[PDB]
Amino acid sequence: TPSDKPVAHVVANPQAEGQLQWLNRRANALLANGVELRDNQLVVPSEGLYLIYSQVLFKGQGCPSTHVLLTHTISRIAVSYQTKVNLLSAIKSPCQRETAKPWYEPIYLGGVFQLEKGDRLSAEINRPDYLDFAESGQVYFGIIAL
Amino acid sequence: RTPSDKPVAHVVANPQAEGQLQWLNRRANALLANGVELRDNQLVVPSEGLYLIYSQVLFKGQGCPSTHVLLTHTISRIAVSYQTKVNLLSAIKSPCQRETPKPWYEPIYLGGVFQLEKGDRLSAEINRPDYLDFAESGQVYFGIIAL
Amino acid sequence: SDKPVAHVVANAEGQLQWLNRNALLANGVELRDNQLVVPSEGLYLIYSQVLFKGQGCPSTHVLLTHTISRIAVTKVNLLSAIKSPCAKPWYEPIYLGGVFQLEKGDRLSAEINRPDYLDFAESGQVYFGIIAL
Ligand SMILES: O=C1CCCN1c1cccc(OCc2nc3ccc(-c4ccc(=O)[nH]c4)cc3n2Cc2ccccc2OC(F)F)c1
């Protein structure tokens, strides 16, 4: 008997230039048991405890400057409050000393949260141009009802 | 649907308590469920088994100082049968390669899967709370999830 | 509990070999040929962590990769990431995890490209697991 757990696993569009865009209509990606993908946000169908997780992989060609900053943030908007709050957020200086060999920064973010029916979750970054799409499974965003 | 019964916790750094690292579950988007407690800044495991522990602290500094900086983040475990701190996980980072002749950001991620015992006390501590960053929620958290 | 479930850990020499002997392996999941075999079509949470270590930075530029693959009941990346670590020692884990609709009889691999940089001190940080939803 299949699970009725609301779940989703969405992957980033490699040819969406200038943006981090989630897709479900791709191999090994899904929306099930009521989770919707609307306006690039995962929409929660029922209240409960959820795992929420996201991966982005950044790459640079050497370190031209010590100043490049990288950000990756999961956000929540609850229907009652109509406000947008970070659940999980990382900021990273990839370059300590100026350089030209390629560098990589994977950021995985996850945890368990109390969510409400109709919440909208978003997973966002500051620099889509630094995203790497060399192989599949490098940029994803999901939730799993516990 | 039947709400899960697995013990889980996600506590966040108190953003009001600068100069300190104080964990809260009484804060937006933080929680304890199914017997996990937060007591004396420590997570307390209600039942035996494998748990995921996960955690992030975010550090930030303005340029680089004279005295070389090391940042440490450590997760340790006090057992009822052995009530002194045993480190389970630790990580360090030198945020600074040379003294500045510009902000830097250094997240430390730290987590793993461990056999825990009922009544285990879990602490997540850092050496440099003056470099810790709470400017926004979601940067500093500490959680466990029973397998 | 009846739900398929597995938590295996690494051992061995120059390889990433998964063992079922702080580990689990129940309810129809099998560890065959270093891959996990799915006993029934359904939704699964799949996860892993590997930890790399080294001392100082060599003159050849090392890339660390770690990947979980689906082997149909062809081989496809489900989860994958890359780190660039560069005579002081250094430590670098890689995290993977997500939910996936799987078919009965699929296999799952979790592999690294440089077993020579693998660690075996923190048993808590080298593992590979699944749980049926
Ligand atoms: O500490 C930090 C800071 C930043 C990242 N990080 C960290 C530390 C360790 C591992 C890790 O990722 C690998 C990992 N090991 C697991 C071991 C066990 C489980 C698990 C969860 C539920 C369950 O019922 N059984 C098993 C999940 C694991 N994951 C992925 C993961 C981590 C956190 C939240 C959710 C999630 O899964 C996602 F939904 F798919 C990440």
Residue numbers in the entry:
A (entry chain B): 7 to 105, 111 to 157
B (entry chain A): 6 to 106, 112 to 157
C (entry chain C): 9 to 19, 22 to 31, 34 to 85, 89 to 101, 111 to 157
Excerpt from the publication:
Tumour necrosis factor (TNF) is an important therapeutic target for treating a range of autoimmune and inflammatory disorders. TNF is a pleiotropic cytokine that exerts broad functional activity via binding and activation of two distinct receptors: TNF receptor 1 (TNFR1) and TNF receptor 2 (TNFR2). The small molecule compounds bind in a pocket at the centre of the TNF trimer and stabilise a conformation where a single TNF monomer subunit is perturbed, thereby inducing a molecular asymmetry in the trimer which in turn affects TNFR1 receptor interaction stoichiometry and subsequent signalling. To facilitate further characterisation of these small molecule compounds in a variety of contexts, we here generate a monoclonal antibody, known as CA1974, that selectively binds with high affinity to the TNF trimer–small molecule complex.
